[PDB]
Amino acid sequence: MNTVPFTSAPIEVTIGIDQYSFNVKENQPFHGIKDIPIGHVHVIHFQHADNSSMRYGYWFDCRMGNFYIQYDPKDGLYKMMEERDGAKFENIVHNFKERQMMVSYPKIDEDDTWYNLTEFVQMDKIRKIVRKDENQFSYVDSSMTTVQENELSDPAHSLNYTVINFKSREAIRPGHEMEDFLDKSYYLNTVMLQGIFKNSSNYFGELQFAFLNAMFFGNYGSSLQWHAMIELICSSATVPKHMLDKLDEILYYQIKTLPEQYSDILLNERVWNICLYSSFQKNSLHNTEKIMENKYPELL
């Protein structure tokens, strides 16, 4: 069980940790989150009480270091930071627990949600999408745009997702124009799985990470990436049976966790109707289809 301490809470803010979240009042004595499950990535995110725009947060993993949060009054935000003095760090964390000023990561033991949403997400891959190699944790906010978005401006602040484009030379072999555009198995399996992602777990990893950034920060380009990678699989006639079953699971839990009220911007009518009902893989997402229908039959 690990801890992320906070120096102080100077401004009124809603703090999130994974799918959980707490309202913290201006200079309310809040000094961190304890009992954080070792073994997965995590994200600690913020939304200021005064600016319900720009959600922001930090992806991290406690095996990679001792991290803490500290409000910066020059930059106006809660910053994650690393403490390299292990002695000094256990000392702060113990004194804060003693004084009991910390919230406990509120995991129900029956609940596999966070595992299921993060199964294939690895910190090492995140830090390639969010290149900032002097920190072990990764910042993301609402307004960050993707590399593909940039191409159609500041690259230090870009989401370096894999670019997917169905009307591209990458995607379409010369002479197989019609075949490759109607059946993307080539593009999925040779170009992306074997070529770029190397395996399915790295693919699913980016898909999930892309979802999550859409969900927690409303990152639009993250939403676009997530749908692209779904569509790519669902528009391929020839998909490993192990990917189809894992996708149906991945997706179910993502649809399950989405706030009901947000289903209008985060869910792309065309892609979903195409994947569940038109695609090669219409018949291969029985749980995702059951949950979509019983929960958002309007979108469909």
């Binding site: 009307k167 591209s168 030379r169 379409i172 124009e177 019609m178 555009f181």
Partner: protein, 237 residues
């Protein structure tokens, strides 16, 4: 963007562009089988590729052998069309390649786009105009060369004949489109109009009669009258 009434004179600037129309690429007759089921027989078709500024026509004849052993033929026909367009562009010298291709039907956008990925600076465009180019097989000389072919073949024409020697592209295109609109609405009458006077002939190298200027006015008025009459009949106005 899409071509419409507003940006219509763009057709006649000096940016090379082509219209592509695929309505006659896959042509079938429908008939009954000995057992009483329905079956189609394909006949030869064509792609109608046309430069509206210069009248040049790239009549790509689509032979029935193209379809042998293929499924989802109406779908294949879009891709086959895009393939033949791309090859035609590739065949052209660079300074002759279009800067724009305008598809008269939106379902061609994706197949062309994909086949033209080698030509990212050729803009593929839809149109809201309701162009009559499907009536091209009502022009006797084109229908004939299409139906006679024994292989894939490219037959080149000027659809304006020698009209541009005396009128502008804009006018030549409006004449073409009025004739074909007439042809399309009532081919029997349209053709009657064009040929009633046996003293006005078609040159062996032309598609249309060698009307004098004054005779074109009479024709174009007769064609307009045709098109209006047919409208009342269709809608009881």
């Amino acid at each position: 963007g899409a071509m419409n009434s507003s940006n219509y004179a763009e057709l006649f600037n000096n940016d090379i562009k082509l219209f592509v129309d695929d309505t006659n690429v896959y042509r079938v007759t429908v008939h009954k089988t000995f057992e009483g089921n329905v079956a189609t027989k394909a006949i030869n078709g064509c792609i109608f590729t046309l430069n509206p500024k210069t009248g040049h026509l790239f009549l790509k004849i689509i032979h029935t052998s193209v379809w042998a052993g293929q499924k989802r033929l109406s779908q294949l026909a879009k891709w086959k069309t895009a393939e033949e367009v791309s090859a035609l562009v590739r065949s052209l010298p660079k300074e002759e390649q279009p800067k724009q291709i305008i598809v008269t039907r939106k379902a061609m956008l994706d197949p062309l786009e994909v086949h033209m990925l080698d030509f990212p600076n050729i803009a593929i465009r839809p149109t809201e105009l309701r162009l009559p180019f499907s009536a091209a097989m009502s022009i006797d000389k084109l229908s004939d060369v299409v139906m006679k072919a024994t292989e894939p073949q490219m037959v080149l024409f000027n659809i304006y004949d020698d009209w541009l020697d005396r009128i502008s592209s804009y006018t030549a295109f409006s004449r073409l489109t009025l004739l074909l609109r007439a042809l399309k609405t009532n081919e029997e009458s349209a053709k009657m109009i064009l040929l009633s006077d046996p003293t006005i002939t078609i040159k062996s190298y032309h598609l249309w009669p060698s009307f004098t200027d004054e005779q074109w006015i009479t024709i174009e008025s007769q064609m307009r009258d045709l098109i209006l009459t047919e409208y009342g009949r269709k809608y009881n106005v």
